[PDB]
Nucleic acid binder design. Structure first.
Ligand SMILES: [Zn+2]
Length: 272
DNA sequence: CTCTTTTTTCTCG
DNA sequence: GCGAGAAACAAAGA
């Protein structure tokens, strides 16, 4: 997932598991708990979930006053809420059991991670990762953004993916954003002029907030939280190779590889 | 059979 | 520091 999908999951969990006491925690893949599964089981068992937050693509479970469980779903992680007698599925790895249901984490590729940290360590955790601002008009300052782009000869798509200019873009929404802002993904950032950077800044905010409003992009429906999204029906370029650009000049969307990633763009709208 | 494809961190030169 | 490439891992498709 990217930020809109994680925010969608966050909202669903907030409605369903806040106020619930954790009765037990069980793992079939304890190695994804990077701070140690037995420690996490010992500390969180019997605690009540107080809230669910998010920073960038990270989910933050607030559990008791003093603990934060930071979860990253990486490429394929999925949460679902099930009854206590639901059968195990092949790629289920962790479960938090409540009195009347359980929260199950599944991840086919085993990339997702859980980290238990203290409340007063959450802000340092994200500072150490150098995560950039949230994609909102209030937090995402164009002036700093502009200065960072000016100092770099990185290509704009990979620099946006780093999460340091702004948090939350992944491959789908960086392709959508650069098409909307009419910028080629291999454009060196120090060549962008002020008006392009302004359009890019606003396009990042608008695309991600639209995606959040529509419940994220679900390339299929699942048993899992966040699988009811509708943003996938609004994508203009991601996965649209060979289809016509929707601005209607008859150009086909093309797919290239940029810094190892599949990259979809309109060669008329997005000139190098 | 092999190769390629689908977030963050790691290696190497 | 940089960029390129690969790796953690699993499954599907060519
Ligand atoms: Zn176009």
């Amino acid at each position: 997932p990217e930020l809109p999908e994680v925010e969608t999951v966050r909202r669903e969990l907030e409605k369903r598991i806040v106020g619930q006491k954790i009765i037990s925690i069980e793992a079939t893949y304890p190695r994804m708990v990077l701070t140690g599964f037995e420690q996490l089981k010992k500390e969180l068992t019997g605690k009540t979930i107080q809230g669910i937050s998010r920073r960038g693509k990270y989910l933050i479970f607030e559990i008791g006053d003093d603990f934060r469980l930071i979860s990253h779903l990486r490429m394929e992680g999925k949460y679902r809420l099930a009854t206590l007698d639901a059968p195990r599925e092949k790629h289920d790895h962790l479960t938090m059991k409540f009195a009347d249901g359980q929260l199950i984490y599944a991840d086919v590729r085993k990339f997702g991670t859980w980290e238990l940290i203290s409340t007063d360590q959450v802000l340092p955790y994200f500072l150490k990762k150098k995560i950039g601002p949230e994609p909102t008009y209030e937090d995402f300052d164009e002036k700093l953004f502009r200065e960072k782009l000016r100092k770099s000869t990185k290509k704009i798509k990979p620099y946006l993916l780093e999460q340091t200019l702004v948090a939350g873009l992944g491959n789908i929404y960086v392709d959508e954003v650069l098409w909307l802002a009419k910028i080629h993904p291999e454009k060196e950032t120090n060549q962008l002029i002020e008006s392009s950077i302004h359009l890019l800044h606003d396009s990042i905010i608008e695309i991600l907030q639209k995606a959040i409003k529509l419940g994220g992009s679900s390339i299929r429906t699942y048993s899992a939280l966040g699988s009811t999204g509708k943003m996938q029906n609004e994508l203009q370029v991601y996965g649209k190779t060979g289809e016509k650009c929707s601005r209607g000049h008859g150009a086909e969307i093309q797919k290239i590889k940029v810094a190892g990633r599949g990259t979809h763009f309109c060669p008329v709208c997005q000139q190098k």
